[PDB]
């Protein structure tokens, strides 16, 4: 039950700006400034039968109205979720709540999402109030202070115990709440927010999200209290968005400070589409619009781009000597042996010239220095990646490409991703405007562009899921039930609100169903079922025809083929150009489908003209987003695309004359002309190659399949409906109903799955795995094997527990165990490592054997699991790196041993440190003294030199 849904407009004036246009962007007011406007939205989720008085009349006991409303709620003692951009001023709301609790002699808690941000907030809060303390997973300081900044992860472990500190706690402030949707660590936020006391109030600070009300309602239902939302797209530093068509000299304003899309400038920008980074930085330098961040999505793209900046220097020798002193002082924190590291020496010349690199591969010391030198204005252009929460604002931000790389494809940047990165432009006070520039290399459609630069932010969708360590922890605690979590998870709340919108689609879907009725239903249905059976068997022969054994012999150059990639995009009839085996340079010996085992280059004449074909890779058949068959009434351009065999609908009996160099100039045009002729001489269609007479497929099972088809056709030819004039008419009326009926049956089950509690079956399945492995008794009373799994959190709690109790680490050496545990701390992918020596392959196979024993139990317990996928999820590629690091090898030796970036090695070593420290504490509970001495020797062996070095 909701109410009080008023919007209110707030206007202000800012200095005028022509930006990069040779003309003013917005009509200036009489005062010589430009008037802007933003909207502040408010709603409240009320619990049933609650005495509520509408806001905009609260009295308090340099502010924006979105702060005034949110503060008014805090003054009234009701929870509030604030949604606004990164610089909009949300911290003003947290400070009021942190103050209102002090003036009442009450305690307030503050949770920070990522690492050090709490520690910096700890120091920042002391200066503002004094009566503040810090509690964290790493260190613990001052609990007795009135206010306490605390890690979010530490709070979840603290609420299971029920430390009763909440006795005199009035407000819990969650900063950057939208991290609750993180697929890896988002479950924690939901867990802690579920376990909050109903008597405590909350202040939720989140970025711009559309579904802010779904979160407030969820708060309202769980904790039986009203919950407000305050939303505003308000951008404090106004932004200007430009498009830079590649290889051109143009710059076009596509959307301005009022978020209005400039149509004419766009079509001009697209007209120009027919080095580049160098031009844009030199422009921004001469126009004094620095600092700049040029975002690349790959770590190598950043370093390569900065290398292309070899010519320019942005710093005077006084500044070059200045930053070099800061650089050298920070390097001093490293051991003298690591101060001559190649990554360190090679980056200094770039820094002296005023150009910086910032990516996850950097050493922890270097990343920190580069961040500071950029703050000091010593670095004028920063080559960075999307992954950053840091305070690194620049006044102009540039994107290398208009597309982001997906796991296997190049996808268009999403509306949200543009919002999250354009926000890195503009600085409060310093800059009158923020500039974002996007280099585009494709004749993108208008509606696609509006969806990007003017799109909407991502929704805050729950990522709650059951965990084995979570379930075991709930068994030790007597007060909270796993069923209770599911019933209160934001996930469950999102399903119970989904079924009324699904029921509307269902009742609408059946309205079309009742209105359809086909005469002679029995005869029409039989004809439909037979044709469907024929459709199925004929698709089955296609797989036999397209299989490499039979197809490859007939895939000569010029062969005519019908292309239907992924059963969706139909390119019509084309000509085979060449074919070769698929090898997968990355992650070799990867399994391929028999039909996907080969890649065929085919010429097509139905490609949409403005499709960006320049993105095509020679052996990557995943067609990038935007490469599509020409729609009706659209121009066609000849091109060559790669396809797997599954993308062939039928193989032709004809074959063209192909030039030696199809890549030559105007050759695709001449072949496209011949394709037009073959398509013209055969308007009804191209004859296919006969599988038995022509292709000589003689397999006996194949012959039985063909006979199964012939039977249904003569069966079809003897149906009463075959000789009817209304056949096409009476069949479409039925086939439209059958599709509807299958759609309705799908939705009928979909609502059933959401009618019950979510993953309630999954909870019973996980518990079955625990009882089977011996982690709890057949009556789910916790066992010792289960108790030790509660202590493990930096890795697979089940497998690490089974390895410890099975004595796998007993027969090993400390250098061997460290390499084994490396498979539990390295999650990112890398190049396949060389074959392991027998000293490291034996404990690996000894763990892979236990892993399969677990995977089979998960599959047998009815959990959706691929056995092969699970065993390979424990990356062993760094085993030799960790092993030699323990044997005394230097950091310079192990870096030349893998393609993993230096910073990533540091992160996993430290992540391995955290895991080994957990197994040390576990040896105390299990009472295994031999294991304690083992893991401690492992920790001292890893913790040396660079990994042991500290931060600034």
């Amino acid at each position: 039950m909701l109410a009080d849904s008023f919007e209110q407009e707030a206007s202000r004036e800012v200095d005028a700006s022509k930006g990069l246009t040779n003309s003013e962007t917005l009509q200036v007011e009489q005062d010589g400034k430009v008037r802007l406007s933003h909207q502040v939205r408010h709603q409240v989720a009320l619990p049933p039968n609650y005495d509520y008085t509408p806001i905009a009349e609260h009295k308090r006991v340099t502010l924006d109205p979105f702060q005034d409303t949110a503060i008014s709620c805090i003054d009234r003692g009701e929870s509030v979720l604030v949604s606004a951009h990164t610089s909009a001023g949300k911290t003003v709301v947290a400070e009021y709540a942190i103050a209102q609790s002090l003036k009442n002699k009450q305690r307030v808690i503050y949770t920070s999402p990522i690492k050090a941000l709490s520690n910096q907030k700890y120091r920042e809060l002391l200066a503002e109030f004094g009566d503040v303390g810090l509690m964290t997973g790493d260190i613990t300081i001052n609990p007795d202070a009135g206010c306490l900044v605390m890690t979010t992860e530490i709070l979840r472990s603290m609420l299971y115990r029920g430390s009763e500190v909440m006795r005199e706690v009035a407000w819990v402030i969650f900063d950057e709440v939208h991290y609750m949707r993180d697929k890896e660590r988002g479950v924690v936020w939901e867990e802690t927010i579920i376990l909050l006391p109903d008597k405590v109030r909350y202040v939720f600070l989140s970025a711009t999200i559309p579904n802010a009300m779904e979160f407030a309602e969820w708060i309202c239902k769980i904790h039986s209290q009203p919950c407000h939302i305050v939303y505003t797209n308000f951008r404090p530093t106004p932004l200007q968005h430009y498009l830079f068509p590649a290889h051109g000299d143009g710059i076009y304003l596509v959307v301005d400070e009022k978020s209005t899309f400039r149509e004419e400038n766009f079509q001009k920008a697209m007209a120009s589409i027919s080095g580049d980074i160098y031009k844009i930085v030199k422009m921004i330098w001469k126009k004094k619009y620095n600092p700049v961040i040029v975002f690349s999505f790959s770590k190598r793209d950043c370093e390569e781009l900065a290398l292309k900046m070899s010519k320019l220097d942005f710093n005077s020798d006084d500044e070059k000597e200045a930053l070099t002193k800061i650089f050298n002082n920070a390097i001093a924190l490293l051991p003298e042996t690591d101060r001559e590291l190649p990554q360190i020496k090679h980056i200094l010349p770039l820094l002296r010239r005023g150009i910086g690199i910032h990516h996850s591969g950097l050493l922890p010391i270097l990343k920190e220095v580069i961040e500071i030198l950029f703050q000091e204005g010593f670095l004028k252009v920063l080559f960075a990646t999307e992954t950053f929460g840091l305070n690194m604002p620049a006044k102009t931000v540039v994107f290398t490409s208009v597309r982001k790389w997906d796991g296997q494809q190049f996808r268009w940047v999403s509306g949200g991703e543009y919002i999250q990165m354009s926000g890195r432009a503009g600085r409060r006070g310093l800059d009158d405007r923020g500039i974002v520039i996007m280099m585009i290399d494709e004749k993108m459609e208008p509606q696609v562009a509006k969806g990007m630069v003017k799109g909407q932010a991502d929704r805050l969708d729950s990522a709650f899921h059951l965990g084995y360590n979570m379930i075991l922890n709930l068994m030790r605690v007597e007060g909270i039930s796993p069923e209770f979590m599911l019933e209160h998870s934001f996930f469950q709340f999102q399903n119970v609100i989904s079924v009324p919108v699904m029921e509307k689609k269902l009742a609408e879907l059946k309205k079309d169903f009742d209105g359809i009725e086909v005469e002679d239903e029995e005869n029409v249905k039989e004809y439909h079922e037979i044709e469907q059976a024929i459709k199925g068997y004929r698709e089955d022969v296609r797989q036999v025809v397209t299989h490499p054994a039979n197809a490859l012999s007939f895939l000569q150059p010029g062969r005519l083929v019908e292309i239907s990639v992924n059963g969706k995009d139909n390119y019509g009839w084309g000509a085979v150009v060449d074919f070769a085996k698929r090898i997968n340079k990355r992650n070799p010996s990867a399994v391929y489908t028999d039909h996907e085992s080969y890649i065929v280059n085919v010429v097509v004449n139905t490609m949409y003209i403005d499709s960006p074909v320049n993105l095509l890779k020679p052996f990557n058949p995943t067609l990038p987003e935007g490469i599509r068959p020409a729609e009706e009434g659209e121009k066609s351009i000849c091109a060559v695309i790669p396809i797997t065999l599954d993308s062939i609908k039928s193989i032709g009996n004809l074959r063209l004359y192909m030039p030696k160099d199809i890549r030559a100039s105007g050759q695709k045009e001449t072949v496209g002309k011949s394709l037009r002729e073959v398509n013209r001489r055969f308007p009804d269609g191209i004859p296919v190659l006969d599988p038995v007479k022509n292709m000589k497929i003689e397999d006996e099972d194949f012959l039985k399949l063909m006979k199964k088809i012939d039977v249904l056709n003569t069966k079809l030819s003897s149906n009463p409906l075959t000789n009817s004039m209304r056949l096409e008419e009476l069949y479409g009326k039925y086939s439209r109903k059958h599709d509807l009926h299958e759609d309705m049956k799908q939705l009928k089950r979909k609502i059933s799955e959401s009618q019950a509690v979510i993953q309630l079956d999954d909870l019973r399945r996980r518990k079955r795995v625990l009882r089977r492995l011996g982690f709890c008794t057949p009556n789910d009373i916790i066992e010792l094997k289960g108790r030790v799994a509660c202590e493990i959190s930096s890795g697979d709690e089940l497998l690490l527990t089974e390895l410890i109790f099975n004595g796998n680490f007993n027969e090993l050496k400390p250098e061997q165990a460290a390499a084994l545990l490396s498979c539990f701390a390295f999650q990112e992918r890398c190049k396949e490592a060389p074959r392991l020596k027998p000293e490291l392959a034996e404990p690996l196979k000894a763990m892979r054997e236990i892993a399969a024993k677990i995977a089979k139990i998960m599959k047998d317990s009815k959990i959706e699991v691929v056995e092969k996928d699970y065993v390979e999820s424990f990356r062993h590629e760094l085993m030799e790196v960790v092993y030699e690091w323990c044997r005394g090898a230097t950091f310079t030796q192990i870096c030349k041993m893998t393609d993993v970036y230096e910073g990533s090695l540091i992160r996993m070593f430290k992540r391995l440190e955290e895991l080994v420290k957990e197994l040390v504490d576990v040896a105390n509970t299990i009472g295994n003294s031999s294991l304690k001495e083992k893991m401690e020797a492992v920790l001292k062996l890893i913790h040396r030199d660079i990994v042991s070095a500290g931060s600034l």
Binding site: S553, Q556, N653, Y657, E677, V678, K696
Partner: peptide, 12 residues
């Protein structure tokens, strides 16, 4: 003309 009809499969 611009092509030929081919029904034989190379490499047996």
């Amino acid at each position: 003309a611009l092509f030929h009809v081919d029904v034989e499969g190379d490499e047996i």
